Write a protein that binds this ligand. Structure first.
Ligand SMILES: Cc1cc2nc3c(=O)[nH]c(=O)nc-3n(C[C@H](O)[C@H](O)[C@H](O)COP(=O)(O)OP(=O)(O)OC[C@H]3O[C@@H](n4cnc5c(N)ncnc54)[C@H](O)[C@@H]3O)c2cc1C
Ligand SMILES: Cc1cc2nc3c(=O)[nH]c(=O)nc-3n(C[C@H](O)[C@H](O)[C@H](O)COP(=O)(O)OP(=O)(O)OC[C@H]3O[C@@H](n4cnc5c(N)ncnc54)[C@H](O)[C@@H]3O)c2cc1C
Ligand SMILES: [Cl-]
Lengths: 138, 135
């Protein structure tokens, strides 16, 4: 496999094109990584969560990493790693349009992880992309 | 609204055996770093090979890691496992040769797909958890 690093613009294309990543957070040196659906816009990754461990850990330590990848041709692939900052988006009017937009894109996907009983109680947030790197195998 | 439940530890081992790709997260000074990784699960441990580089350097400094694995279910369903783990680097010694040889026999073709020394290592599973979602 030719493996090479991706340009900044190639990294953006991978993030833009995909909807699922793995999000890692940490507490006291211990990482924690889970899958997450996101929507890319404006050098942020937007997402919804129910309350829980990852939200608690990111509230206390907003340093995160996100990994996103896709297939190419044959055994080919492209992968991006984002080093980021968690920013919670409280349910206030200044974030309502962001919330409405994100929810409309993620609403369907949210039906694929959100536990049923037996975007109101949801935590809406974004990951600000501070550093980004990419790799491709041909 | 998915039907979601927690898996037993036994159910988690079955997911780990049935899959060969995970995401490995390590950390340095509070900053996580997550990359894809091919692994072979065996007894208390995930085994993998790597070239020298950032993840290996970070794990040498801080052995605390997390590994996430998932697979599809019926329809929109899925199962996911998260391992809270401790990195242990494995020199090429007789006591680890069977572990290495077995791991390579499971992963040798896959290694072609990402590409002098290999570093051979394992992650000791300290906690494991899982989730299953059904439509
Ligand atoms: C493809 C896909 C997309 C998803 N998208 C989202 C999303 O956008 N937003 C969202 O909030 N969740 C999403 N999930 C579910 C997410 O991965 C978590 O399972 C869920 O959010 C609960 O995480 P938590 O930290 O709140 O766990 P808590 O409810 O606080 O539970 C903590 C315990 O559960 C375990 N645990 C939690 N999740 C998993 C898991 N995935 N696998 C194994 N163990 C787990 C932890 O290790 C720990 O033991 C998605 C899942 C899949 C497979
Ligand atoms: C399905 C699949 C299976 C893989 N299996 C293995 C395996 O078993 N063993 C193994 O060593 N590697 C595997 N890889 C490659 C792995 O994900 C890393 O890209 C590679 O090991 C280099 O990691 P490093 O920490 O040594 O980075 P270094 O060579 O030390 O480089 C660090 C820099 O490159 C960036 N970087 C590293 N990896 C990636 C990536 N995946 N995507 C975007 N940026 C990246 C970092 O963010 C940082 O900027 C696999 C990849 C895929 C897609
Ligand atoms: Cl699968």
């Amino acid at each position: 496999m030719l493996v090479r690093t991706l340009s900044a613009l190639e990294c953006t294309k991978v993030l833009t094109a995909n909807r699922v990543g793995r999000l890692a957070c940490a507490k006291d040196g211990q990482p924690y990584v889970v899958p997450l659906y996101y929507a890319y816009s404006d050098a942020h990754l937007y997402a919804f969560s129910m309350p829980g461990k990852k939200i608690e850990w990111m509230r206390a330590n907003p340093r995160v990493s996100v990994q996103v990848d896709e297939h190419g041709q044959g055994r080919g692939w492209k992968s991006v790693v984002v080093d980021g900052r968690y920013e919670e988006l409280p349910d206030l009017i200044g974030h309502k349009l962001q919330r409405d937009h994100a929810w409309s894109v993620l609403s369907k996907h949210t039906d694929w992880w959100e536990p049923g009983a037996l975007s109101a109680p949801h935590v809406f947030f974004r990951i600000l992309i501070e550093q980004v790197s990419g790799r491709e195998a041909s």
